[PDB]
Design a protein around this ligand. Structure first.
Ligand code: YPP
Length: 260
């Protein structure tokens, strides 16, 4: 179609590999570009870890208030929030918000530990019907983004469907779903990605991701004005290991989709 020709031209101009999935919940139509190819998730995987903890809190009602100790040994390469609490505690709610809104890598590792390892995060995906998502490693090695490596990957189609279920569907309880939406809407790292290609009046909740091989990702739920919400996943990776991030590509992909 028209949108797919423009996305293909965008990809060609960028020198990388672009994957897009859009779900328009108004009629459940989909727009896919490389929708069934695997891409490295990098920090977009944090949404699944936070959601898995939220699902646990449907039974363990006070779980989000559980204090978790932050020790110097827990700190990894990027810990903007956890660093402020070393030798103190953060609750699981606070770690979830830090993982989602600041992309804190120590917070992600604490969430993974709460779930019993990367196997526990992947298990949650399977339980809500996502057979594609796989989390294999912890932070920071899950961001190596090596071409062809299936570890820590998903496909655009699978992530779009799963993000729809978590935020607009009923994979989580009502209180848990509302908390996830609130967290995504308060993301602080997304201003130059999907959001930058969309009308300023639209409300967006997103989670970015970046890694080696110039990997630049963003996944978002979009609430347009007076119109059904959309789910948009944009994944981008490049042939050179130390390639620079290309958030402009994600913005341009969103702009092309929003033109439809
Ligand atoms: C060999 C192990 N190894 C290989 C790959 N790797 C990374 O990919 N780290 C990445 C990382 O730690 N990214 C962080 C993360 O994993 O939420 C944050 N998420 C990004 C985002 O949401 O867009 C960020 C730019 C807000 S930093 C990284 C990407 C670009 C620039 C600096 C760091 C590492 O640093 C690393 O330890």
């Amino acid at each position: 179609s028209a949108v797919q020709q423009k996305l293909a031209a965008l990809e060609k101009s960028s020198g990388g590999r672009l994957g897009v999935a859009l779900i328009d919940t108004a009629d459940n139509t989909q727009v896919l570009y490389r929708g069934d190819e695997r891409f490295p998730m990098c920090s977009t995987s944090k949404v699944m870890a936070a959601a898995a903890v939220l699902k646990q809190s449907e039974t363990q009602k006070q779980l989000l208030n559980q204090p978790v100790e932050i020790k110097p040994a827990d700190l990894v390469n990027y810990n903007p929030i956890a660093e402020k609490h070393v030798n103190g505690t953060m609750t699981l709610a606070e770690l979830s918000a830090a993982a989602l809104q600041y992309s804190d890598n120590t917070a992600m590792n604490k969430l993974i530990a709460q779930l019993g390892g990367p196997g526990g995060v992947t298990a949650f995906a399977r339980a809500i019907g996502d057979e594609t998502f796989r989390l294999d490693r912890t932070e920071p090695t899950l961001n190596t983004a090596i071409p062809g490596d299936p570890r820590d990957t998903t496909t655009p189609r699978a992530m779009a469907q799963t993000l729809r279920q978590l935020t607009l569907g009923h994979a989580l309880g009502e209180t848990q779903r509302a908390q996830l939406v609130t967290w995504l809407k308060g993301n602080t790292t997304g201003a130059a990605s999907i959001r930058a290609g969309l009308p300023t009046s639209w409300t967006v909740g997103d989670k970015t991701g970046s890694g080696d091989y110039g990997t630049t990702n963003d996944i978002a739920v979009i609430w347009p004005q007076g119109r059904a919400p959309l789910v948009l996943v944009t994944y981008f990776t490049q042939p050179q290991q130390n390639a620079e991030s290309r958030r402009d590509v994600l913005a341009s992909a969103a702009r092309i989709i929003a033109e439809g």
